[PDB]
Amino acid sequence: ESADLRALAKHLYDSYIKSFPLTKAKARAILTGTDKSPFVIYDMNSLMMGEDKIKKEVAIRIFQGCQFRSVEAVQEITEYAKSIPGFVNLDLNDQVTLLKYGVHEIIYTMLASLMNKDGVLISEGQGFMTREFLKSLRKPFGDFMEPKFEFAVKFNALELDDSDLAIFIAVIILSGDRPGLLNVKPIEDIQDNLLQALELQLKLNHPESSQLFAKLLQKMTDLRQIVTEHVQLLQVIKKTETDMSLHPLLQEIYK
């Protein structure tokens, strides 16, 4: 019955709003156009005055604030996961495993909400760091964000809104094919109901967008690739910057 899927869609949207303070709707109002105009960081001076207005090497300090924001995002995604019906009733090891692998695919999904072709909102939308300034950071740091922009440009052309994303990131978390899952079947039963929900949601919300559901699920492939590329550059950093510390919560996601 569609009524039950609409109720699930509504539940997850409500929890998403509660768990993610910077939504895509807010990010697009900030990026498009008086009380919400962000300060723009495009070089080192705008950076140093940006810290003054908004709020070690330049690249490492940017990398470490990015680290802190990721930890914060992990916390938010975790809070959202527990609202997905059935999630907290799963085996606790499977909960950990589903978060461990799901968290980065969700981070880059939602970070797309904060991006356009030219840069990324930061500091809850108070700031905007341009793509070019990031790419000009010294190796290996200038190559961190470029694949994320490349994904976001394609992903953002689907024109999903927050109510679509709430279901989609739930579908991501409840992925039966994560390595080491002790009991795959109850996870998959939840995901099918979420997939049903996502499907009805995309049909109702984007009636003229043919096979959006299929196109969205195929994006769940560019995501895995970005994760793989990402952990590769972190390992470069561990050996390059033996003075630089990774946050422990992020340490455990990457083991």
Ligand X SMILES: CCCCC/C=C/C/C=C\C/C=C/C/C=C/CCCC(=O)O
Alpha carbon distance 103, 243 (integer Å): 26
To ligand GW9, the closest distance from the beta carbon of 70 in angstroms equals 4
Alpha carbon distance 80, 83 (integer Å): 5
The single residue among 6, 10, 28, 69 that binds ligand GW9, judged by CB under 6 A, is: 69
Instruction: Tell me the per-residue interface mask from 128 to 167 with ligand X, x by CB under 6 A, - otherwise.
Output: -x---------------x----------------------
The single residue among 41, 73, 106, 134 that binds ligand GW9, judged by CB under 6 A, is: 73
DSSP assignment of 107-135, as one string? HHHHHHTTEETTEEEETTTTEEEEHHHHH
Q: Among ligand GW9, ligand X, none, what binds residue 107 when CB lies within 5 to 8 Å by partner kind?
A: ligand GW9
| Longest Cα–Cα distance in the chain | 58
Alpha carbon distance 60, 56 (integer Å): 7
Q: Would you say 133 and 41 are in contact if contact means Cβ atoms under 8 Å apart?
A: yes
Q: Among ligand GW9, ligand X, none, what binds residue 153 when CB lies within 5 to 8 Å by partner kind?
A: none
Query: Count residues contacting ligand GW9 (CB under 6 A)?
Result: 10
- What residues are designated binding site for rosiglitazone? 67-70, 104, 230, 254
In the complex, the residues that contact ligand X under the rule CB under 6 A are 62, 65-66, 69, 72, 120, 122-124, 129, 145
